[PDB]
Design a protein around this ligand. Structure first.
Ligand SMILES: Cc1cn([C@H]2C[C@H](O)[C@@H](COP(=O)(O)OP(=O)(O)O)O2)c(=O)[nH]c1=O
Ligand SMILES: [Mg+2]
Ligand SMILES: [Mg+2]
Length: 239
């Protein structure tokens, strides 16, 4: 397939079907969908079950269990890295179990990369709907080419060439960073690595949406943050 879509899943039984269905109904159909479930509860697994009948879906479930294992690494990064190693697509893209793809997301993003060989990473605008019906509507625009993506661009808003992964792994030893010090902002850290080599090209359309209204947290290491990443890129001076 042209595109590999990598989705991570963990215990969002009330949202995951909408997410998966939004991917499977894309107008561009030439993709494989990795559903990397991190050993979710019964309810979640049962909502995911019927989707496994679509031949484009590649389902993998970890054996992760307990607070030690859940905090040993940034789980979704470990899962993404695993998917990346099995991927066949020329273009890579990400999804989560509570994010919805708009129907023409893949078509448009594929077309942008097919049409501009000079662009290696692209990003779209993203929208969030607040519920309480709708009360608030937020949009994260994509108006400029950026060498400083961390914390300005989300997980589910990007698509890139497989070749980018090559570069990143050559310099850093892995694709995404599994260190649990980057648990809250794993996508930002991956973007930080990419931004050592590639800028992010905008596609000014809203192509993904989010709907919104402890022993785990207490067992992570101290969490590094955005400023730290952004400041480090600002240095460097790639743009
Ligand atoms: C906590 C956890 C999350 N995940 C996945 C679920 C999500 O797809 C992804 C991001 O988690 P999520 O909790 O949705 O992050 P955010 O706070 O930004 O909404 O990580 C795992 O795969 N394993 C885990 O142990
Ligand atoms: Mg979320
Ligand atoms: Mg986030």
């Amino acid at each position: 397939p042209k595109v590999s879509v990598i989705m991570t899943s963990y215990n969002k039984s009330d949202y995951v079907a909408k997410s998966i269905s939004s991917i499977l109904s894309q107008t561009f159909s030439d993709f494989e969908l990795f559903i990397m479930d991190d050993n979710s509860n019964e309810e979640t697994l049962n909502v995911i079950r019927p989707f496994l009948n679509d031949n484009r879906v590649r389902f993998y479930q970890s054996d992760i269990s307990g607070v030690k294992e859940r905090t040993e690494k940034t789980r979704y990064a470990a899962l993404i890295n695993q998917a990346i190693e099995m991927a066949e697509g020329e273009y890579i893209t990400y999804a989560t179990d509570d994010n919805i793809y708009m129907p023409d997301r893949l078509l448009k993003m594929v077309r942008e990369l097919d049409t501009h060989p000079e662009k290696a990473v692209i990003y779209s605008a993203s929208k969030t709907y607040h519920l309480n019906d709708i009360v608030k509507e937020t949009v994260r625009p994509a108006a400029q080419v950026t060498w400083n993506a961390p914390c300005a661009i989300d997980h589910c808003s990007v698509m890139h060439r497989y070749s980018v992964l090559e570069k990143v792994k050559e310099k850093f030893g892995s694709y995404w960073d599994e260190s649990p010090a980057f648990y809250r902002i794993g996508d930002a850290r991956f973007f930080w690595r990419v931004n050592h080599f590639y800028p992010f090209y905008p596609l000014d359309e809203e192509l993904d949406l989010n709907y919104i209204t402890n022993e785990f947290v207490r067992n992570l290491p101290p969490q590094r943050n955005c400023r730290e990443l952004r400041e480090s890129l600002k240095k460097l001076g790639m743009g």
